[PDB]
Amino acid sequence: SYNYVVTAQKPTAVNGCVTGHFTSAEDLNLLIAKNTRLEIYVVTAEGLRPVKEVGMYGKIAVMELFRPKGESKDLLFILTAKYNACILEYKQSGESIDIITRAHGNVQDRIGRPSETGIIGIIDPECRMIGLRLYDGLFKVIPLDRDNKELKAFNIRLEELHVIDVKFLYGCQAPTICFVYQDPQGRHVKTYEVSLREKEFNKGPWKQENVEAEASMVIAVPEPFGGAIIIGQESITYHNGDKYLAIAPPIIKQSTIVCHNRVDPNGSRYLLGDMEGRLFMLLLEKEEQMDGTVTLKDLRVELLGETSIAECLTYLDNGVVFVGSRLGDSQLVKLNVDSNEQGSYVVAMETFTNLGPIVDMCVVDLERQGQGQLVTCSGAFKEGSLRIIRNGIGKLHIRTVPLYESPRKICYQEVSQCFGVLSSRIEVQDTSGGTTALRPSASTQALSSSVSSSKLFSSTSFGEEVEVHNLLIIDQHTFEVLHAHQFLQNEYALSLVSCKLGKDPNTYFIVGTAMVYPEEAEPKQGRIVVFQYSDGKLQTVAEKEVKGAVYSMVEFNGKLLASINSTVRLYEWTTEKELRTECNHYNNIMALYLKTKGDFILVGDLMRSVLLLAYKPMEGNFEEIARDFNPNWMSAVEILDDDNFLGAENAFNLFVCQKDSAATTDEERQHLQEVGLFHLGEFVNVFCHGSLVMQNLGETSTPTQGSVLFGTVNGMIGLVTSLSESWYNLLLDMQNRLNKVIKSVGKIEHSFWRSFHTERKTEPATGFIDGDLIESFLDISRPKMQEVVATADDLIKVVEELTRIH
Amino acid sequence: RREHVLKQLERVKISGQLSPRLFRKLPPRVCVSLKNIVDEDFLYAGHIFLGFSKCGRYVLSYTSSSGDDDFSFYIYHLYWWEFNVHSKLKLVRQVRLFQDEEIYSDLYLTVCEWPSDASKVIVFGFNTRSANGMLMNMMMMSDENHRDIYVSTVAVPPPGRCAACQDAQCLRHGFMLHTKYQVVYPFPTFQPAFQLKKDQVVLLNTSYSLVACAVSVHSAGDRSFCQILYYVNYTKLYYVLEFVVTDLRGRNLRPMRERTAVQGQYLTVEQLTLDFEYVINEVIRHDATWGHQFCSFSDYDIVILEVCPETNQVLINIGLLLLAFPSPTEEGQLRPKTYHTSLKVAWDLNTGIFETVSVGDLTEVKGQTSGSVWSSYRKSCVDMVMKWLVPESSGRYVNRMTNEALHKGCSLKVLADSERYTWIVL
Amino acid sequence: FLKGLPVYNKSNFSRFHADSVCKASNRRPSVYLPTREYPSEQIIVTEKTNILLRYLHQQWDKKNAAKKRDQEQ
Amino acid sequence: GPMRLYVGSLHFNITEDMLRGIFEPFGRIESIQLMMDSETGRSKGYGFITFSDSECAKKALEQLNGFELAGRPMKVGHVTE
């Protein structure tokens, strides 16, 4: 198998935001990291003026602006998830914009396991060095010196093997690291002086201090105050030698602080973002001394209001703050001195679209037939929404349906002209005994409502967050919630299907649930519930008690195929309108993903790769045809054709395995040979057969066959289409020839970027074509289109024929 | 406070962060009783189940057949079984370990897997003490001064397909390398994590030397060759189908010994040996500050401190019992005393050259037991290794399998496949 | 009060607007497609020597230089 | 063998092979029993070392009991069964 992976929608989630003087010494820049993409903006009178979008051949893990001595303006240090490190300089010769790779190199160590709280990259205030925390028990030091032709990086052993967060302190003679670490005694704070000469750590300027158990973040307070602020779940603390201040504001206890931003250059004010979306101001009371020095008198936090759930907060200028979001839309907000009728000092100026995370999606011909439309489940919690995406002639068009709760599953019921959506809302228990909703949502504002009156499970804590699961019936035109069916107390709706079963002429909404009690962490009981939505009303038809969690559900030749924990079970729909077990498959670990094509079933396991089952209609039982013996932790699966299967794995790679054609024995026929490997760089949650392009109605013989859309955590939408061996061999030579002409920022080889990579193995990319690199041929200059060596100079006959999809 | 599995799965969908490291505090997803997956039940031979392979596809076991013929000579077999969750285990390979070997005492055997090289496994076997040259009614009786070490490298069953060139079953990488050496007191320590830190290479401490043994297979492609040594002893040998004495074989018997020119599949056996006494004398002569005071050395103990497979460097510590004249200070007569010291030496596997890293000071033994000296020296090595410990990536570790059910240390309770969260309950 | 917020330029955001209800999927930044190759001043390289081996070698050199203090104090 | 010894208060990274290397210089060992936690696959920090000669065990106890190993003072004592 040979495939063509192309971007339909670029990642929309904001992974990191940084400010400085990169494009010019006078220009105030905003740099946004959207996974692999670096967006450069200049803060102007009109707002944010776009500069250029840098497409890195790597996931941006570290993005920091710094200015060494004598340097005209700031330099940018980038570290990728594949450990490619670079120092970048912005150059503009009138109209010609160029990014210079000052220093490049890979900083991966064969030894060392990646750390729990992931890659951390810090730069010394005096720009004496770069400090990397990649692996447990190691601190990488990159000395900053332009005099030598090489930047000789070295590791210093860190006794504290479980580091939570680290910062370089200000006002120090020698570079000093301050860090929070975990050990059996709990969490603590520690300091170390870094010696570039001896290549070791020296005694820290201030002794070990016992910090809060949930102390997650370290703030390096600039040169006037000095020291470090530590933020936990219940408290905020300041530390600078013998100086110590701790505050326990009951307001911050409700939700975890996840991001911070220094507002004032001296460090008097800090913005603090909540998991709830709440915005805070941390105030550091100044204390001017006769010596000329300054100390900290007090600490105070003030609630400013609400924003989108922030990943990164960034003060820009004149009270304007950039709210970088990954679970919702990003925003430009205004901090006003006067509060509104609600009591909020924050006012939204602009909203920027984020489709991510895409947890589920479906392809439907909504407005007119033949023209496909994507209907996704987007965001999480108060940022939860439905996004209707289409290729609109007069590029991509997005309609937002806010739900103010987490959308989970989506299916379409054409006969009912509506969508069946699974949703979860967070409810907190009060002194009343019963739980109360934090804010109104799609499940509480529905026109008609119903509660599960099931008695099947015949035989709570204050402040504790509980999930309330509902099946929402949404109109396809208005996108109004017609009905909301609340499932049982502690019941979690996991899977959803819309189909006709057996000889029954009615189309049903089928929901696979799981009981989640606070007492037990394991799913030991669930239900499969059959509902019918008629003339405005939703009715419960049947229920079947299962001995676990109903992870996946697929209609299978008029039968209901379901995955209950490690079991793959087939059900029949009786004339008594009940579900009856036909056959079972038990050889699984966590059967989370199921796909069907004819009598064949593709089983995706969370821990044990993929398995192919064939249902035998004569024997009325399953047969394990083939297995992918390779270890893979799966995120999503898809059936490309009868003998080729597409898989998405936890290390953001794509794979394709096929039934062995040169297999002679029965054992060799049971082996699924991986014939396609590609590093996508995205975490795929859903695969869909579909196109956003019109059926035919005037079309020519396409170079590609098949059409598989996919949704990712970053909001990226992509297509996978199968190619011919002739088309693949043509585009493969083209891809390698384009790499000799198309240069790479940070000098990262494209072949390296696209290589299948895991903590166990690294193999080159095979059976896959990077559609984005091939399509970049239309954007380069005519004299540089010299990648063609036997004639047909105008290769625009191809590439433009490839852009025709999406 | 342990979280619900479904809350964790919900977090994966919105974060894009899925890993075994993240789920480490989660209980096993599936537990199978050995009884329910084993065939021919009631008393199915002497199968001592060792554990899972790194890939999680094979479950390994072994047999120790004593054979009551009065004299009793032990026979050891290694088995590979295909695992399939709730389905019964299927035997894929039955191999005999240490062929033509007179095993007088029950060996403690350990099966090891290399960090990334999955094509072959290594089996270490050792007795408590060597069998003598005498007999005392009840039994053979042991030699308290010697111990036997048996080392066998066996090829792992192919993942499937290729080399259908059967010409009648048997295959191409169905090779077996096996060796045997004797050790003296203080009996060298067993360090499988370090001895196998470099793929296809095993470091062996024979009391008198450190032997680096590389076993590799090559097709008639001239692209690759020599990992050991790109002066001290080096021996390279070639073998085709149809100093530590290593006798090669197929899955049953001997292959033809060939020389370079052979066009087809070929095996290579390399051995780089470092002589301890030469190293000790060279360090004292050129780098020890007390080298003038030195007379002779009574005994030595070598412990590996680190193996760097990227730079092909082996860091060893040498515990030395020696005789030396005390400091030139005159407090009467200056008779040579017995001292203990330690020398740190870095051995380059590419050049074969060794470099002095550290030379310890002379410490007076003052009527201590030789055992007390070696025990204290080995505690100092454990201390150093533990102190400089840096956690490594999973799937780069050395899989060490043991089941001392027959060695009064009692049987194992669980055989776990941690990456798939699967337990075989014995 | 809590507000007396940093001003880098009074002109910044004074003329701002797009005026639309919660919508902007504008990928206005032009993609940077490099063709011209410019050399690098440096290449980031990792020190090959093991941390234990590095420490034992320099600690021995510290002890040796401490012994070369001879011919008086 | 004449003497069984309880070895306790060990660091969880200390292996059966390390215990053999540290106790073997005193004399012949009949068996080593490092206790493993089934649920984790790591050590319980204790075990049993049976020597072939009681005098070797007594000397091992004298020199190893109360002394540090990986910064943790080792506990060695006589045990029946």
Ligand SMILES: NS(=O)(=O)c1ccc(S(=O)(=O)Nc2cccc3c(Cl)c[nH]c23)cc1
């Ligand atoms: N968990 S660990 O500390 O990283 C670790 C654990 C085992 C090994 S070993 O397998 O190489 N054995 C080992 C090392 C050092 C001294 C001794 C003695 Cl004495 C006997 N066996 C020893 C290395 C590192």
